[PDB]
């Protein structure tokens, strides 16, 4: 198991190196053209996310069925955390792409979209207030991939027991890595555990935004 042998520094490098490319949009709006542009972008990012997943330590050790399932459960969370990270230095705005930077009033162009825009903006703010580091970001993005589908495999099957154990062990490695970044940056033990908790609590907000998003997307179809 390559993944469980990595030092914290090695894990961070692997994750930094895995990063997908930052995509440009094809960019006078409407509901159709904006959704057109955002759909085009999401679909092109998804092609790169799949390749990125294969480079996340642990991921390709899983069965093909579970690799699929993880991405199927996580893909919108992962799009959203990416958005929110690249939006950090643009308060009041979401940076879908370097050439596609939108405020909450353009959210209102699509029925039911502003509520989710506001949530995404609130998350980007929260990362800004916390000085989320790139190293921490890449750890959080992998946690999302590995964690979001892990509870909804089959159960009471021997194979699933082995799969979950493996994911939990990799997740423990990513936790150790996060604490390591914090300890290296000077924080007290107390400040370490506190920031870790803060970051992981934000993940349940991202889950919530993803579920609300799917709900909004499905209702356009």
């Amino acid at each position: 198991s390559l993944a469980l042998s990595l030092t914290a520094d090695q894990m961070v490098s692997a994750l930094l190196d895995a990063e997908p490319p930052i995509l440009y949009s094809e960019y006078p709006f409407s509901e159709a053209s904006m959704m057109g542009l955002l759909t085009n972008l999401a679909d092109r990012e998804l092609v790169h996310m799949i390749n990125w997943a294969k480079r996340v330590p642990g991921f390709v050790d899983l069965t093909l069925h579970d690799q699929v399932h993880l991405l199927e459960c996580a893909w919108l969370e992962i799009l959203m955390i990416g958005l929110v990270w690249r939006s950090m230095e643009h308060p009041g705005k979401l940076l879908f792409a370097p050439n596609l930077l939108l405020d909450r009033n353009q959210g209102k162009c699509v029925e039911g979209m502003v509520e989710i825009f506001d949530m995404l903006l609130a998350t980007s703010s929260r990362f800004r207030m916390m000085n989320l580091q790139g190293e921490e970001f890449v750890c959080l993005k992998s946690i999302i991939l590995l964690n979001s589908g892990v509870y909804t495999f089959l159960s009471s099957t021997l194979k699933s027991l082995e799969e979950k154990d493996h994911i939990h062990r990799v997740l423990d490695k990513i936790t150790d890595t996060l604490i390591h970044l914090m300890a290296k940056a000077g924080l007290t033990l107390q400040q370490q555990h506190q920031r870790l908790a803060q970051l992981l609590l934000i993940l349940s907000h991202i889950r919530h935004m993803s579920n609300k998003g799917m709900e909004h997307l499905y209702s356009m179809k």
Binding site: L46, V47, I50, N51, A53, K54, L64, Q67, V68, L71, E72, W75, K221
Partner: peptide, 15 residues
């Protein structure tokens, strides 16, 4: 796009 997601994911993983 509920079926087209899984196929898109499938093709990317095996290649």
């Amino acid at each position: 796009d509920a079926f087209q997601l899984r196929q898109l994911i499938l093709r990317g993983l095996q290649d």
